[model samples]
Target: AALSVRNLSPYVSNELLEEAFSQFGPIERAVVIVDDRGRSTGKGIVEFASKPAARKAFERCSEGVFLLTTTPRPVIVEPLEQLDDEDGLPEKLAQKNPMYQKERETPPRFAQHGTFEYEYSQRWKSLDEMEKQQREQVEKNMKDAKDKLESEMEDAYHEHQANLLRQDLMRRQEELRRMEELHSQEM
Candidate 1:
């Protein structure tokens, strides 16, 4: 049959799968997904004798059907064709688990490392001349600040040295003037 399903839970196993598929018809084969740890991924493949049978099983067995075992829980199912239909099919279900979509608390992730890889990756890219100019202006402002600080420090050093020299010369000139006045008075 031209039908397939994916992303099953790790709890699924061959016997449980067979039991579920057997309700629909003679399952040609039912295989459970196993991890490197040998634990079932709770997912598996169930191949039926015909496409119509598989579709029947998928419709009947979707995520709401509660199966009983050591731990009874709902099993998810979707027809391969139904899931992939895009022309008029609803996009939300195709993108996520349709049955559990309403119960999801967190908003869908939209990042470079998430479902919207392209959008996230392009976030830092330059979009227009004004943005590019603003970025360059920031860099230039930083460079100008450094240069201005250096120039101010240089001017401060020269001014301080000149003030000290001028004070020393003023003290020497005052003493000379007093001595000259005292000699003139003696004369």
Candidate 2:
């Protein structure tokens, strides 16, 4: 069984966590979420096979050590729980989440903000600009692709020519060897 620790001081490093948990037993896995900007989200998961070991870890340091910069004390620890099932959720809550209603709705609005509106002239302007950009991008991509293909073709052609030349030279060398052997036999 595994216990979850959350809202810990973000300063706590993985090395420190693993070291602390290792005192209890072997750590199965440790994962820390990094944001888009590649910074820790101060949340992570640590799994262990032995429940006793996990419990021991919980007893030792639940929210981490306090005051130490590395320890970053006061890490909240709690048992992981399964999400509430459909039966547990209220009818209204379930209906809203599922977008279900007393009656059938054609299209559910996923966003609470509702639909966005744009002026006709603005839409036309955006469409024209997008079309122009698309055309330019397509032409550039096609030209680049064509140029790359042509360059590769040229390289392959040269390689084939070189291979043929080598074969021809080898054939001439074999013919010369035969001629020399015939002359030696005459002697």
Candidate 3:
């Protein structure tokens, strides 16, 4: 179960919300909505492992004193259902409502807003970039090695051709010598 908290002082941070509600029981997730400027929108949602814990927190926050800054103020807490319903309005009427649709679609990178998920995403991005660089370096090294090997093979092939030419020339010179020696003997 989850509860929607309202009237969160602008000074309240995400950690403070967890610290306050966690007193009741375990928290599965906590999200504080932020505006385009990345400031808190004075509201948040906290999910608890069980309905009892959520209700407990709701009642506590609504009835108890949860100080936001220097002084205590009313922190309105209610079930997500209570906040989500458009005052008993029909689904057709609520269709165009941004808040109504907003709840249905989980924001892209929702976890990356202000929690440990943000840190994890940053670490993942760094690791991904490093991996891309490493792959490029390995590819470059392989191409260089292949090129060097091909160049060495070409040199060896030319050397082998030169050796074969020398062998043929020596054989021809020997045949000519044999002919001249025979002719001299005959003369």
Candidate 4:
């Protein structure tokens, strides 16, 4: 997927985008579309080397509410049309391309409809549904844990258990902090 990022601030630079988005994965190209006068049109395109990386980057930007410096609103990120072998060729020449017929004949795996737009919509819908289900499960699990904790709150060993949990949380937090530092250093 090539991400079409809209509502970008005019000040945003390609270097900044590459640096910020590269944390998610390797980028194939990062371009901020410009007008004839060289002014930004508040839109950009980012292409990743792999599908998974592109998806992850898209989710991170779209789902995780990515914010760029100088932007007042969150940018909209979505999959855009990619150039294939027959992209720039004439219709007759494209027809001669080996994969052209096969491409039109066989739709993508996640595609219920032949159109790329509809296929992408379906995939994103599925992704949203999966996330919703996971969120519901997590909420249920948390509720169960809270209920169990509440039930055992007045127990003799409640304080000890709470103390242990606090210690464990603190330990994990420290570990996470260290990991983040290491990650930053690598960059």
Candidate 5:
């Protein structure tokens, strides 16, 4: 029986995988899937020599078993490979391993290109969220500061005009008294 290992660190090597699996029991074979370019996708399959060995390894891994330097030890799937036996027609193949219909809505990687696509595919998305948040925050602060200055300026200008009106009234009252005194003297 074979156990499919997923989430392997790229650092893990084919030899290292075999060496790790060997401790459980004799391994029939161990291979990490690598593309033609020798890029390991961090997926592998380790075949055990017998059912007892397979069961032992699976039970240990189902709990906690670390391999190599990878953290959150590689996940193990029962078989190296599988597909729905019913194809797509068991009530739309009521999936045994139900990815369910919703999985398709998000979709998976389709860029199939290099660094620029790499940026747009997923990397740029995080930066987009940050940019939006910062811009909105800065805009809010600008509006708040503008309102404070505008309100204070209006209050100060009105106070200054009121003070000028009071001074003019006082000057006029003094002039009136002087004129009245002159009239009385003339009489």
Candidate 6:
């Protein structure tokens, strides 16, 4: 009754996902993975109380056209392993979790605890990461071009200054000749 989810938007929190899917079934567990800065990583898991509930929710998102929020990128839903081998330890949060301990007391609760758990880092390389790479590429390329243009522009300004000096020197030479010629005429 557990499902794997991906392509989530930055807008979706665990609470938001759980609330949205509650209409489909009893939400045993729901979570959206977050990065170090506590922003959504666009991956998550949802475990339903029953197979029917899980199926209903799965059908809703199976097409990957279902918008979970206002975001344009649709959510993708897929079948998760019912019992993962990597169930123990911190990232899974299965046995160590207090909620897990309480679910243990419930009669006939399944043996697999971390059914919804997976390493957040193992989540797919999202479009955001790809965009970041492309964005950095753009910034780097522009910086190099900008530096070359600025350096050439400064050099051009200095060359223009030298041209101004050459023009002034020629004007002075012509004026001196004219003055000498006028003095001779007056004599």
What are the candidates' C-alpha RMSDs? 31.5, 21.9, 31.5, 18.0, 27.5, 22.0
Question: Which pairs clash in model 2?
Answer: 63-75, 65-73
Best by TM-score: 4
Q: Tens-digit lDDT track for model 6 on 1-187?
A: 8788887777887798888778788878899888899888879998888898788778877754667775345778898867667755563566767788777685763335445433333243465798899999998998798567657866787899999999999999999999999999999
- Clashing pairs for model 6 are none
**CA lDDT, candidate 6, residue 154:** 62
lDDT of 2 at 97: 58
> Model 2 misses residue 68 by how many Å?
6.6
* lDDT, each prediction: 0.68, 0.69, 0.80, 0.82, 0.77, 0.78
TM-score of 4: 0.44
Comparison by TM-score, 2 against 6, better one:
6
TM-score of 5: 0.41
Regions more than 4 Å wrong, model 6: 82-187
lDDT by residue (1-187, candidate 1, tens digit) is: 5335444445556776788668777878878767799987656667788778877777766734746444333566654443544567456755576556575666665564445666655665646666999999998997798568656866787899999999999999999999999999999
Q: Model 1 segments beyond 4 Å from truth?
A: 2-11, 63-70, 81-187
Clashes of 2: 2
Candidate 4 C-alpha lDDT tens digits along 1-187: 6888877777888997788688878878899999999999879998888889888877777767887774235767898876687557688987888888878986565544678887689779999999999999998998798567557646736688889999999999999999999999999
**Ordering by lDDT:** 4, 3, 6, 5, 2, 1
**How many angstroms is residue 143 displaced in model 5 relative to the true structure, after the best TM-score fit?**
37
- Candidate 2 weakest ten by summed lDDT: 109-118
Model 5 spans with C-alpha error above 4 angstroms: 70-77, 82-187
Span of ten consecutive residues with least summed lDDT in model 3: 65-74
